[PDB]
């Protein structure tokens, strides 16, 4: 029941470039975007915002993933040769799936 | 709350 948006980030630059806070076992239990690297893929996408909470990466829930593991999954999603994009399911609010 | 960059 959260209000969510599926944002596709194409790999238009050599970096993804998002700073994320939080993760499991913290008071921000899913990663929240706190800033965006100018000139990176997330910036070029335009649809990712500071304050966006990442519910899923390519359909995979981040619930229960501690910060370092969530960061690892997102890094792998950006590096993969499977596809030239990442789909982030995001929400502006504090309701989780 | 931890914070880090994913480049």
Swiss-Prot record, chain A:
Residues 6-89 form the PDZ domain. It is found in: Cytoplasm; Cell projection, Stereocilium; Cell projection, Growth cone; Photoreceptor inner segment. Disruption phenotype: Mutant mice for isoform 1 appear viable and comparable to their wild-type littermates in growth characteristics, reproductive performance and general health. At 2 and 9 months of age, knockouts show a profound hearing loss across all cochlear frequencies. At 28 to 33 months, they show signs for retinal degeneration such as a thinner photoreceptor nuclear layer and outer segments shortened. Expressed in the retina. Colocalizes with RPGR in the photoreceptor connecting cilium, a thin bridge linking the cell body and the light-sensing outer segment (at protein level). Detected in the inner ear throughout development from embryonic day 12 to 20 days after birth. Displays a dynamic pattern of expression after birth, demonstrating an ordered appearance and fade-out across stereocilia rows. Isoforms 5, 6, 7 and 8 are not detected in the retina. It comes from the Eukaryota. Forms homooligomers. Interacts (via C-terminal PDZ domain) with MYO15A; this interaction is necessary for localization of WHRN to stereocilia tips. Interacts (via C-terminal PDZ domain) with MPP1/p55. Interacts with LRRC4C/NGL1. Interacts with MYO7A. Interacts with RPGR. Interacts with EPS8. Interacts with CASK. Interacts with CIB2. Component of USH2 complex, composed of ADGRV1, PDZD7, USH2A and WHRN. Interacts (via PDZ domains) with PDZD7; the interaction is direct. Interacts (via N-terminal PDZ domain) with USH2A (via cytoplasmic region). Interacts with ADGRV1/MASS1 (via cytoplasmic region). Involved in hearing and vision as member of the USH2 complex. Necessary for elongation and maintenance of inner and outer hair cell stereocilia in the organ of Corti in the inner ear. Involved in the maintenance of the hair bundle ankle region, which connects stereocilia in cochlear hair cells of the inner ear. In retina photoreceptors, required for the maintenance of periciliary membrane complex that seems to play a role in regulating intracellular protein transport. It is linked to Defects in Whrn are the cause of the phenotype whirler (wi). Mutants are characterized by deafness due to malformation of the cochlear inner and outer hair cells and by circling behavior. Stereocilia are shorter and wider than in wild-type animals and there is a decrease in the number of actin filaments in inner and outer hair cells. The number of outer hair cell stereocilia is reduced with increased spacing between them. This is Whirlin. It comes from Mus musculus. The chain holds residues 822 to 918 of 918 of the full protein.
From Swiss-Prot, chain B:
Signal peptide: none annotated. It is found in: Nucleus; Cytoplasm; Cell membrane. The first L27 domain binds DLG1 and the second L27 domain probably binds LIN7. The protein kinase domain mediates the interaction with FCHSD2. CASK and LIN7 form a tripartite complex with CASKIN1. Component of the brain-specific heterotrimeric complex (LIN-10-LIN-2-LIN-7 complex) composed of at least APBA1, CASK, and LIN7, which associates with the motor protein KIF17 to transport vesicles along microtubules. Forms a heterotrimeric complex with DLG1 and LIN7B via their L27 domains. Identified in a complex with ACTN4, IQGAP1, MAGI2, NPHS1, SPTAN1 and SPTBN1. Part of a complex containing CASK, TBR1 and TSPYL2. Interacts with WHRN. Interacts (via the PDZ, SH3 and guanylate kinase-like domains) with NRXN1 (via C-terminus). In the N-terminal section; belongs to the protein kinase superfamily. CAMK Ser/Thr protein kinase family. CaMK subfamily. Multidomain scaffolding Mg(2+)-independent protein kinase that catalyzes the phosphotransfer from ATP to proteins such as NRXN1, and plays a role in synaptic transmembrane protein anchoring and ion channel trafficking. Contributes to neural development and regulation of gene expression via interaction with the transcription factor TBR1. Binds to cell-surface proteins, including amyloid precursor protein, neurexins, and syndecans. May mediate a link between the extracellular matrix and the actin cytoskeleton via its interaction with syndecan and with the actin/spectrin-binding protein 4.1. This is Peripheral plasma membrane protein CASK. It comes from Mus musculus. The chain holds residues 920 to 926 of 926 of the full protein.
